[PDB]
RNA sequence: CACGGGUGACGGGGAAUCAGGGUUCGAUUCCGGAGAGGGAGCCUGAGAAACGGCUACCACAUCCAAGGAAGGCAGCAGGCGCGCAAAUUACCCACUCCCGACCCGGGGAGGUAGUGACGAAAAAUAACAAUACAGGACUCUUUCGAGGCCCUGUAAUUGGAAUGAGUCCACUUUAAAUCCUUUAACGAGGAUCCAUUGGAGGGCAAGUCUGGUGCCAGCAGCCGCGAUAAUUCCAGCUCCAA
C-alpha cells in the first residue's frame, strides 16, 4: 500500500477498484466487449457450416501449408478459420457440412505455426474427426 | 437348525398386539419363507398362526442372519381393525380392487364433465 | 424437493506434482511391498494420514489443559488404539506425528491374512478375500479395505460356507468327480 | 496446395498388428511391474539405463 | 458519489480454492420476495389484485354448419424451435405429510420403477505347485564349481484347486413389481468370459530400435521437430502415466 491512514479504507477501495481495470484478465472477464466479440459467446463448442477450405501458409522457420476451414456459425453467423488437426482429415470434410468447432487452449490466440487461426474442428456431422482418423466409424453417405 | 430370537419386545394394549424384531439364524441354507416363520412363531408363542403377521426381511451379507419385524394380534377382528389391507392381501383374507388408477382418473374426469344423474351411465 | 442426503466426500487427493520420480518410487515400493491394486489405494490412505496428522497439528497448536484439546486428543488416541496402528503404551498425542504410511498399511486385512499365514502370498490373500473363503466374527468379508481392529484381529479364520473349510467343494472338484464317475460308469 | 492431403498416410505401407499374449491387468500388472523393476536387478556401478533402453 | 445507466444481478444460509489475508459462483431441493406471454380491474373468501378464478386491450392460438363457442404446461411426463448442452407421453397413495363433512376418499406434493460415465464411494480382468534358468545372507576353494538349513523372479512347459460377469428353480424385497443378499443345477487355461485413454527431446516418466516420407505430409499448450541417417511425422515392437 501507499497511504497508511487509520480511516483510508474508502480511498484504498476506490484506488484498487480503479486499478483492477488495468489488468488484462479482469477487463476481459468484466467487460462485455470481449464477450460480444467472442464468436462462441463464452461457450466451449459451436456448430457451423463449412463454406470453403483454405490453405494457409505457415510462419517463421517452421513452414507448411496448413488446412483450415472457413466455418459460418449458426447462432451468430460469424466466420471462423478453424483448424483440421490430424493428417488426411480434410477429405472427410466437404462443402456445406455442419461441423463442431472448439478452441485450442490458449484462450483466443493463434498457436505455433498457424497464424491468425484461433479455433479447431472437433466433430464433423455428428461423427468425430478422431474416429474418422482412427477408422472406427464411417461417414454416412 | 433354524433359530428365531425376538428382540425389542413390546406389549401394545392400545394396538392390542405384541411386537418384536425377529432375528433368524439359518446356518448354511437359503431364506426361510414367511409361512415357516409364522409356523415357528406359532409353536413358540403357543397361539394360532392366523394372527401372526411378519414382514420386512433383510438378509445380512454372508448368509447366516436375517432381520425382520413382526406383530402378533389377539383376534382376526382386531387384525382387520388395525392391519393394512395390502398386508392382509399378502396372506389372502382380503382382495383389493382391480381398476387401475389411470382409468379411474379418466372415469372421474368424464363424470366431472357430464352433470346430473347420468354419471352412472357415463362410467362404464 | 426430494428426501435424500447429497452428502459426499472425496477420500483421495491427487498430488500437486504428477510425475515426481521419488514419489512414484515410494508409491511403487509401497504397492510392491503391501500388495495394492492401484495408486488411488495409496492416495486415499495418504489422505487419511493427512487428516490425522492435520488434526494432530491442530491439537498441538492448542494450549495444554484445554477441554476441546483433551477431548479430541483422547478420542483420536482411542480411535488409533481400536484400529491397532498405535501401541497401548504410546497413547500420547505428540507421538501421532511420528507415524507412517507403512504402519497404516500393515493393518489392512490383506496384510493381516498374510501375517497370520493362512494364505500363501499377499495377492493370494487378496484372491481369498475376493473368492470369499474367510469370515470375521461369523461375517464374510469380501472387500479387503476392512480395517482390522485389535480386539477382532484374533477372530479371523476361514468361513463356514467354504470349500477350503467345512463346506461343499467347488466347481473344479465337482467337475472332476463328475468326469471320474462318467469315466467309471 | 490442398491436393496433397494425406500424402504420407496414402504412400506408407500398412503393417498388420502382431499377435501377442494378453497382458495381465491391475494388481497383477503392478505386481509384475514391481518384479521387473526391483527384485530382478542388482545395484551396479554407473548410470542405470532405462526400461526401453536398447543397443 | 446523490441522481442517471448497465448487470450473463432475486437476496441469504451456503459451494470451490485455500498458510494468514482474500478470489470466484450461488437459478437450484432450507427461508423470505416475484409470477404464470405483457399490463390493468374485480367478485368470493379470514386470507388473492388468485390466473387447473373471472373481466377488457396487445401478441399467439383451437372447433365451426360461418350464427357462434373456447385457451393459458416458468406443474407432471411428452412435442417443435433454440441450441455445445440436459431423461418415460410408466406404477402407486403403501413410506413422509396435506385437505375434507374427515379412522374409510383424494393428492404428477411425495414415494417407487425406466434413460443416465455431471459427480461421489467400494471394486473384477487371477493365484498356487513342479521342471529349465538368473541371482542374494553362509562352509570350502586365489577363481572355476558344489550343498541348501533361509530364499525372489521369468517362461503358449504342465497340473489341478477356488471364485465371479452372465443364464436360472425358489425365498426375500414391494401397494404389485424391480435392485441387493442367500440358495439348487449350469458356467474359465490363447481362464477369447481378451481394458482402454494420452505420451515417449526438455518441462514431466518413458528406444538416438526397424521401414517409408524428405521445410511435402504432418508433430507440438511453450521452447521447438521435419530439406534422403526424424530419439518429436506415419506404421510394427517395447516402455511410461491412470
From Swiss-Prot, chain A:
Functional summary from the UniProt entry: Component of the ribosome, a large ribonucleoprotein complex responsible for the synthesis of proteins in the cell. The small ribosomal subunit (SSU) binds messenger RNAs (mRNAs) and translates the encoded message by selecting cognate aminoacyl-transfer RNA (tRNA) molecules. The large subunit (LSU) contains the ribosomal catalytic site termed the peptidyl transferase center (PTC), which catalyzes the formation of peptide bonds, thereby polymerizing the amino acids delivered by tRNAs into a polypeptide chain.
Family recorded in the similarity comment: Belongs to the universal ribosomal protein uS12 family.
Keyword set includes Membrane: no
UniProt cross-link Glycyl lysine isopeptide (Lys-Gly) (interchain with G-Cter in SUMO2), position: 36
Superkingdom of the source species: Eukaryota
Subcellular location: Cytoplasm, Cytosol; Cytoplasm; Rough endoplasmic reticulum; Nucleus, Nucleolus
The protein's assembly and partners: Component of the 40S small ribosomal subunit. Part of the small subunit (SSU) processome, composed of more than 70 proteins and the RNA chaperone small nucleolar RNA (snoRNA) U3.
Start-end of Basic residues biased regions: 1-19
Species, as recorded: Oryctolagus cuniculus (Rabbit)
Main location: cytoplasm
Full protein name: Small ribosomal subunit protein uS12
PANTHER family noted in UniProt: 30S RIBOSOMAL PROTEIN S12 FAMILY MEMBER
This protein's UniProt keywords: Acetylation, Cytoplasm, Endoplasmic reticulum, Hydroxylation, Isopeptide bond, Nucleus, Ribonucleoprotein, Ribosomal protein, Ubl conjugation
Post-translational modification N6-acetyllysine, affected residues: 134
GO cellular component: cytosolic ribosome; nucleolus; rough endoplasmic reticulum; small ribosomal subunit
Example GO molecular function: structural constituent of ribosome
NCBIfam families found in the cross-reference section: PRK04211.1, uS12_E_A
Residues annotated with N6-succinyllysine modification: 53
Region: Disordered, residue numbers: 1-25
Keyword Ubl conjugation (UniProt): yes
Gene expressing this chain: RPS23
Any Pfam family hit: Ribosom_S12_S23
InterPro entries the UniProt entry points to: NA-bd_OB-fold (IPR012340), Ribosomal_uS12 (IPR006032), Ribosomal_uS12_euk/arc (IPR005680)
In-chain residues carrying the UniProt-annotated modification 3-hydroxyproline: 61
Modification note: Hydroxylation at Pro-61 affects translation termination efficiency.
GO biological process: translation
Swiss-Prot record, chain C:
MF term (GO), any: rRNA binding
Cross-link (Glycyl lysine isopeptide (Lys-Gly) (interchain with G-Cter in SUMO2)): 92, 138
Matching InterPro entries: Ribosomal_uS4, Ribosomal_uS4_CS, Ribosomal_uS4_euk/arc, Ribosomal_uS4_N, S4_RNA-bd, S4_RNA-bd_sf
Keyword Acetylation: yes
Modified residues (Phosphoserine): 152, 162
Record-listed N6-acetyllysine modification sites: 65, 115, 154
Family the entry assigns: Belongs to the universal ribosomal protein uS4 family.
Name the record gives this protein: Small ribosomal subunit protein uS4
Organism: Oryctolagus cuniculus
Gene name for this UniProt entry: RPS9
UniProtKB/Swiss-Prot annotation, chain D:
Superkingdom of this protein's organism: Eukaryota
PTM sites of type N6-succinyllysine: 47
Cellular localization per UniProt: Cytoplasm; Nucleus
Function: Component of the 40S subunit of the ribosome. Contributes to the assembly and function of 40S ribosomal subunits.
Subunit structure, as described in the record: Component of the 40S subunit of the ribosome.
Protein name: Small ribosomal subunit protein eS30
Gene: FAU
Boundaries of the shown chain within the full protein: 79 to 133 of 133
Amino acid at each position: 500500500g501507499k497511504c497508511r491512514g487509520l480511516r483510508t479504507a474508502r480511498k484504498l477501495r476506490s484506488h484498487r477498484r480503479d486499478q483492477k481495470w488495468h489488468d488484462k484478465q479482469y477487463k476481459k472477464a468484466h467487460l462485455g466487449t470481449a464477450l460480444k466479440a467472442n464468436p462462441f459467446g463464452g461457450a466451449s463448442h459451436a456448430k457451423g457450416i463449412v463454406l470453403e477450405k483454405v490453405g494457409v501458409e505457415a510462419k517463421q522457420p517452421n513452414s507448411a501449408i496448413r488446412k483450415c476451414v472457413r466455418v459460418q456459425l449458426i447462432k451468430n453467423g460469424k466466420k471462423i478459420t478453424a483448424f483440421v488437426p490430424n493428417d488426411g482429415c480434410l477429405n472427410f470434410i466437404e462443402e456445406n457440412d455442419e461441423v463442431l468447432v472448439a478452441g485450442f487452449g490458449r484462450k483466443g490466440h493463434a498457436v505455433g505455426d498457424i497464424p491468425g487461426v484461433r479455433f479447431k474442428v472437433v466433430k464433423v456431422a455428428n461423427v468425430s474427426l478422431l474416429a474418422l482418423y482412427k477408422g472406427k466409424k464411417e461417414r454416412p453417405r | 437348525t433354524v433359530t428365531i430370537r425376538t428382540r425389542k419386545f413390546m406389549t401394545n394394549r392400545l394396538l392390542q398386539r405384541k411386537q418384536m424384531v425377529i432375528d433368524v439364524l439359518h446356518p448354511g441354507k437359503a431364506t426361510v419363507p414367511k409361512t415357516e416363520i409364522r409356523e415357528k412363531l406359532a409353536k413358540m408363542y403357543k397361539t394360532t398362526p392366523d394372527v401372526i403377521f411378519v414382514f420386512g426381511f433383510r438378509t445380512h451379507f454372508g448368509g447366516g442372519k436375517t432381520t425382520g419385524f413382526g406383530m402378533i394380534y389377539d383376534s382376526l377382528d382386531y387384525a382387520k381393525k388395525n392391519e393394512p389391507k395390502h398386508r392382509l392381501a399378502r396372506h389372502g383374507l382380503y382382495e383389493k380392487k382391480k381398476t387401475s388408477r389411470k382409468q379411474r382418473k379418466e372415469r372421474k374426469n368424464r363424470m366431472k364433465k357430464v352433470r346430473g344423474t347420468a354419471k352412472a351411465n357415463v362410467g362404464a | 424437493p426430494v428426501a435424500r442426503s447429497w452428502v459426499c466426500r472425496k477420500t483421495y487427493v491427487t498430488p500437486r506434482r504428477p510425475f515426481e520420480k521419488s514419489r512414484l518410487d515410494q508409491e511403487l515400493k509401497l504397492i510392491g511391498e503391501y500388495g495394492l491394486r492401484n495408486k488411488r489405494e495409496v492416495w486415499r490412505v495418504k489422505f487419511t494420514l493427512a487428516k490425522i496428522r492435520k488434526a494432530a497439528r491442530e491439537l498441538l497448536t492448542l494450549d495444554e489443559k484445554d477441554p476441546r484439546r483433551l477431548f479430541e486428543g483422547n478420542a483420536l488416541l482411542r480411535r488409533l488404539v481400536r484400529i491397532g496402528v498405535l501401541d497401548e503404551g504410546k497413547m500420547k498425542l505428540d507421538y501421532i506425528l511420528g507415524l507412517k504410511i507403512e504402519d497404516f498399511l500393515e493393518r489392512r486385512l490383506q496384510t493381516q491374512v498374510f501375517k497370520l499365514g493362512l494364505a500363501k502370498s499377499i495377492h493370494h490373500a487378496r484372491v481369498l478375500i475376493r473368492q470369499r473363503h474367510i469370515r470375521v466374527r461369523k461375517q464374510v468379508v469380501n472387500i479387503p479395505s476392512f480395517i482390522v481392529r485389535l480386539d477382532s484381529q484374533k477372530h479371523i479364520d476361514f468361513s463356514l460356507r467354504s470349500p477350503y473349510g467345512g463346506g461343499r467343494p467347488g466347481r473344479v472338484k465337482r467337475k472332476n468327480a463328475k468326469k471320474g464317475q462318467g469315466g467309471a460308469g | 496446395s490442398l491436393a496433397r492431403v494425406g500424402k504420407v498416410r496414402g504412400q506408407t505401407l500398412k503393417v498388420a498388428k502382431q499377435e501377442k499374449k494378453k497382458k495381465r491387468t491391475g494388481r497383477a500388472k503392478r505386481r509384475m511391474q514391481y518384479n521387473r523393476r526391483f527384485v530382478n536387478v542388482v545395484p551396479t556401478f554407473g548410470k542405470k539405463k532405462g526400461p526401453n533402453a536398447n543397443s
